[model samples]
Target: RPTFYRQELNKTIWEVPERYQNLSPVGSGAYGSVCAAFDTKTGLRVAVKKLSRPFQSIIHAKRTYRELRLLKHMKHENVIGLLDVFTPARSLEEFNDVYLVTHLMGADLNNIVKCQKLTDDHVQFLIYQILRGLKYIHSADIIHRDLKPSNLAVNEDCELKILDFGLMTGYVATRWYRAPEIMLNWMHYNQTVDIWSVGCIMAELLTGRTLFPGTDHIDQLKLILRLVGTPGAELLKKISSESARNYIQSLTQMPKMNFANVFIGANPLAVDLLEKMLVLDSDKRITAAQALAHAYFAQYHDPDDEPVADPYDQSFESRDLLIDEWKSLTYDEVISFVPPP
Candidate 1:
């Protein structure tokens, strides 16, 4: 019953390009719906992310801009790449829905981690790719505020990539994996927050369960404090808010448990890395660069290994686009971008 006509339910509202055929819904969220489609022109399967009412609000507009901006600028194996951008609208005035084309992946890390049993080698390589991705993100002075299993994508080849930059606005979900600073509502958090989430993921891979299965915001903080213990005086002083500081001071001091006791049967090096990463103090947490050189990845790290060449070397110096500038910039990107071969 399929026809060449683009009309849907007797209304022709911005039909997906005829080139992208047999589109099947893959996923949907607050951001928008994603579908897997065959790129007939390129002869490859790709994911099409249809951004949700991107210009509905300032927040939505800002996120849409940042997501597109980062994807276009970042050219790395660890970070996701933009294959193409398209819209059925004929002009800027008609443009409402924006579709971003990207390489289709088999599954996300969230599903993989839960369904499969990973060996030590699997854990090492996966974590290495994540840290490599984080290294690039941090170099750009960007914090991937939402670093969770679901946000990370992977293929059958074990190649992993970091995605979902839409939630980089200092707020994220899945309280169980959020950092202590985010949980405490500290506005001045940095890239180290992602490291905490990385630690949570690593622990989950070994344990096959959520590291901090908190029911609520307060419960998340309590779970973190229970495992990592209270922050030291020097670290406590770094709290920017009076209420957050007072609240921390009022909590009972819980001693950090031995890693061996918590992550039974996990590699000693991994446990050591987790201890460094899961610290309550963001300042005290391990950086992505530091974690890469750790002994946990000693088997893979080579002294003679040259750094991955960055195509957007000068892109680091560029400042983030202003919220108002997002609308025009995003429109231009959709209108102008040509996918790389």
Candidate 2:
């Protein structure tokens, strides 16, 4: 465990000990890099990420470190867990990288979608896990900015987990899995936007199509309005964009298409549950906790073990930090790793 080795990928170097072996590249982005490896100690294959320049700038640094800070504190099976985190630079002067190790599943929701057809139980349980995770995430004073099919990982056992902590993003019956708000730049968005995302995901899982897809931003709003129906003056009143609000006012009044008819042949209970998430008014949309408690998940909903997370610390986010401050803060997190016994 004390020994460490060097790995070269994309001309980039990674230094991690032999506890994990057979490193295989999986994915990469501006945020950093990823690989799949087998853990000798845990007897499980794992997903690992080599963080890029976290000290890139104040904005980028905030997001980079926020990922680690949240992952470290979150605890739930539905949510991805950070199994191990570390950095290789021994010299304080060069401390600049962060490596994260997490569970590696058979495939993402995208894979599951193409592999085969799914049963109702699979869809039901899959959504239950999403709500379970979302419930915990919301309790922690956060919103998963991203939720889509490729983000959700699963196995043959039907177990699913949400991944991509950089944005705390999701999955579906497959490629279809993946929201809106802030178009009006009205009031601040809350957990409601996340609820909207799940609604679309649930819709796709049932019908094998997108719920309110639009090619461009304006058309997207039109897509949403055509289905959910246009907002009333009182509802539109809060929107600060006067011209947009007037545009909404002058537009054709569209009636909401019934979910039952839209998702024909779908179980009424399932549609009932979805109605809770897709409400146009953020004020009335079902919250994650309430959604979990809905009867749709009666068989699988177990409140006893599903837990809440400690509220996230906003102190780091509230302040602007220089790259030096980001480095020091991130390295401190690197040394905090405690692996499985």
Candidate 3:
């Protein structure tokens, strides 16, 4: 184990309910949280995710259930595994207090990406894994609405695992990776949204920076139109939502944008795929399964192959290696490094 991992382990997992011994606090999320516990008998690092009250809000509760339901039905190399579920009580209170157990994966895509500039091959490999994972998720018609870097992690074996199911509303991904249809507030949608996010992630991986570094939703929409070009008037007219049409018309003055020129000197394969993914119309955007078939990844690896055993189990484990090293800073401390206005 690395110094950071060891240091994190030294922190007590919990202050209360010491009954669950050998507990190591891992991280937290919107609806619940995760903790790593040492199973004394087997000496295994078992991760536990606790769910909040399920009965109070049926919809939220169902969404919680939907995560397990989706995980149960789909199994892929890039998808996290669900080992078991634990109910603390024998009654309703126990049922409400639920904990999901699974293997503790070491890192994720975000962690891997934060450490380095992703070569074209690395981007292809990542996109391949994401498409494979999406293929599995889409086969069941379960959309992962939250497909951002932070929601991803890499295992010790260097396999990418998509995480954070809480924000997965099955409607729209974050504004940065969200498709135009979802941004236009169109109710009808499908797997194309996931593909769009995959493209954004690829761009981020390539440049070691955000593809759409927008402060808010409006900025993100502008970034999209700037790169992919605005929808045509004919296409805009077909949209019944007045606001969506108005939004489309507002960007008419912007010149048509294409990745071919923007990424001209880069890998031809990556640039080609990006163009397909950034299509203005949702229907025209390439499918996740089709993206997997792209020739960029055909030469090197197959996403379906189980990740090579212990690929990332070596000395370098932190995401900071490829990216800028970060340190905790107060507002005052950061001011010293700020450039002159």
Candidate 4:
């Protein structure tokens, strides 16, 4: 265990790279960088991320370290698993990297949200799994501050898992996915923050579009009020000071909508669940655990042929062995790894 005030800021315990093979960049985010690589001994495909360095000034780093610690300690099927951690053998001048490893999955939720329209069952399954992950995180006293389509990932067998822990704070999720109370600056939140994002993602998925996606703070706020009705005085008072609360109250009332009947071909259950998730007041939002208890998930199943398993379990070997490394080979490296796609 690290000492109480250890300098994880520059330590290299999580920087070892010789431990992994075929290191290649995969994704990048506010807190760090992600890479896809192989475990030499087990020959397993893993996605690894090197988080931002800790700093005395940046408040964001605490969230970064918190996520690392949480992933290192927590375990859940619906949550991304941390398989290995390392600091770049090379120092910060060269890289100063913190590598976090999890099994490679099918595609990120962003891809699905943008690429295909989701049926109600698909929406329910996706949200249910994310809530399951959130339930576990909250049970451990952690909050997934940044919950959204991109943060959710799917495996080959169609099971969903939540990712990105760098923002597990009192306020989290993107503007579109953020709860009204959070936007109003309420700090007494727990896990319901993630459910708001789940609702945003579900709406976007069914419509093959975005709900609260805005480029600036003003527009984001405008979008929020346009959907959920303006916050009442009592609700706004709990969230912010008079000035901020009054400003939001003046924005606009929710535009008229029959969202329940909007997506002509969408699932009613999914639509109902989405409504519950996208509410404006964070305090009034349903807990992920409560959502799990709902009847919505009773018929949900991962779209995979094989039963979902922990990313680190022994059974994972067979699954990894069946995937050709060339399948994931980059455009530039594909020729060298295999004949052709």
Q: Where in model 3 is the C-alpha error above 4 Å? A: 1-21, 38-44, 92-94, 165-174, 300-341
Instruction: Candidate 3: give the clashing pairs.
Output: 89-94, 107-153, 107-154, 108-153, 108-154, 109-153, 115-319, 115-322, 115-323, 116-322
Winning model by TM-score? 2
Q: lDDT tens string, model 4, 1-341? A: 21111122223233334546666666664466666768675677888665655432234333444455556555667887667554433333333334567777768876655556455666666666777777667766566776777777796556887777535222233566766555555557656777787787767777776776666666676777766767676676675466676676666566546667655577676677777777766777877667776666767533341122222222312332211231121111211221111
TM-score of each: 0.86, 0.91, 0.74, 0.71
State the lDDT at 132 in candidate 4: 70
Candidate 4, pairs of clashing residues: 14-86, 14-87, 15-86, 15-87, 15-88, 16-87, 145-173, 157-304
Residues 201-285 of candidate 3: C-alpha lDDT, one tens digit per residue: 7787766667776666676778777877767656665577777677667655676676677654578878888888877777788
Estimate every model's Cα lDDT from 0 to 1: 0.77, 0.77, 0.59, 0.59
Quantify how close model 1 is to the true structure by its C-alpha RMSD in Å: 4.5
TM-score of 4: 0.71
After superposition, candidate 2 runs with Cα above 4 Å error: 165-178
Once superposed on the true structure, which residue ranges of model 4 sit more than 4 Å away at CA? 1-19, 51-64, 87-97, 166-174, 251-256, 301-341
Residues 171-279, candidate 2, lDDT per residue (tens digit)? 2222122244654455576776778878888887888767766655566677787778888776787666667667778888998888788987787889998878878
lDDT of 4: 0.59
Better of 2 and 4 by TM-score: 2
> Residue 152 of candidate 1: its Cα lDDT?
85
Which scores greater on TM-score, model 1 or model 3? 1
